[PDB]
Design a protein around this ligand. Structure first.
Ligand SMILES: [Ca+2]
Ligand SMILES: [Ca+2]
Length: 314
DNA sequence: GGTAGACCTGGAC
DNA sequence: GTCCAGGTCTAC
């Protein structure tokens, strides 16, 4: 059929594949796990969302990652568009190598990794990542998802429509910095987070040097990148880490939230050393991130995703 | 310098 | 009718 979301079975000639075994990527463990909030399983095993300014539907078989694009006459994805998918999932990074190493230095990781293979990090756009996580504050994944959709719908450019779903690109800095955005966001239910979206959009354009200032962080060290991000309204130590990890290519970045605290205590019997507090505080949270970095290495953040993801499965 | 309380809301015991 | 989710900000 020419309408609605496509499936591999119904529109054979419109899909193209990318060699990728399920052991290197599990869509169902990556896409709805709190990394990106813009993918939906409209059909069983078929996920749709915006990727590289276009709408896609992705699905996998044991050895392949099938992709289709909705842009002109309908056709299969081209080799270059397909490369956009490979980059988004950072497919050049071998997950089997990472799991092996983490499992070698951490017996607990080894036991948990057995059942949760294919958990990796998406290479996300900084703007979308910054504002999506500004909205994650004291929030759950299902709600965050709603807020983000409503936000893109009201301020993001309109893409194509499939069935009754109209896809929108993520809002630009200029749009989010506009007049009365906060009030509009409050009517959309963002709460106090509405204030931060508006404020950070303006801070970036009117005080930090614009988009270029954000994008240049990819070349800066984790230390430098993380410090700059905390300048923004609504961005604390955690939000900044999420952004460094998921959008600025800092794999050693470890976001410390309540989930990670429960994991550290239960599975590692961890307790703060150099810090005062017995529980969560800026000093203890910083120490915990260091604990995981020294345990897992340069890609501690990715290791964190494997457990964090396998933890949400409870 | 390091804790305590306000800020929004909708699924949940 | 109370409680929590990938926190942040600020007063003292
Ligand atoms: Ca800040
Ligand atoms: Ca927290």
């Amino acid at each position: 059929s020419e309408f609605g979301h496509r499936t591999l079975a119904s529109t054979p000639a419109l899909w193209a594949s990318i060699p990728c075994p399920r052991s290197e990527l599990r869509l169902d463990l990556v896409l709805p796990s709190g990394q990106s909030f813009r993918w939906r399983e409209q059909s069983p095993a078929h996920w749709s969302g915006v990727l590289a300014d276009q709408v896609w539907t992705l699905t996998q078989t044991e050895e392949q990652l099938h992709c289709t694009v909705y842009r002109s006459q309908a056709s299969r994805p081209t080799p270059d568009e397909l490369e956009a998918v490979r980059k988004y999932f950072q497919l050049d990074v071998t997950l089997a190598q990472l799991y092996h190493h983490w499992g070698s230095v951490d017996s607990h990781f080894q036991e948990v990794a057995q059942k949760f293979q294919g958990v990796r990090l998406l290479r996300q756009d900084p703007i979308e990542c910054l504002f999506s996580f500004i909205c994650s504050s004291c929030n759950n994944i299902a709600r965050i998802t709603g807020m983000v959709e409503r936000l893109c719908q009201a301020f993001g450019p309109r893409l194509i429509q499939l069935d009754d779903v109209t896809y929108h690109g993520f809002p630009s800095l200029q749009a989010l910095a506009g007049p009365e955005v906060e009030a509009h966001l409050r009517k959309l239910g963002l709460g106090y987070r509405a204030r931060y979206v508006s404020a950070s959009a303006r801070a970036i354009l009117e005080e930090q040097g614009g988009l270029a200032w954000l994008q240049q962080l990819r070349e800066s060290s984790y230390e430098e990148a993380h410090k700059a991000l905390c300048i923004l309204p609504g961005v604390g130590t955690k939000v900044a880490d999420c952004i460094c990890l998921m959008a600025l290519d800092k794999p050693q970045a470890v976001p410390v939230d309540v989930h990670m605290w429960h994991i550290a205590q239960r599975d590692y019997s961890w307790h703060p050393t150099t810090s005062q507090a017995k529980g969560p505080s800026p000093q203890t949270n910083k120490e915990l991130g260091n604990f995981f970095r020294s345990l897992w290495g340069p890609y501690a953040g990715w290791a964190q995703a494997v457990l964090f993801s396998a933890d949400l499965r409870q």
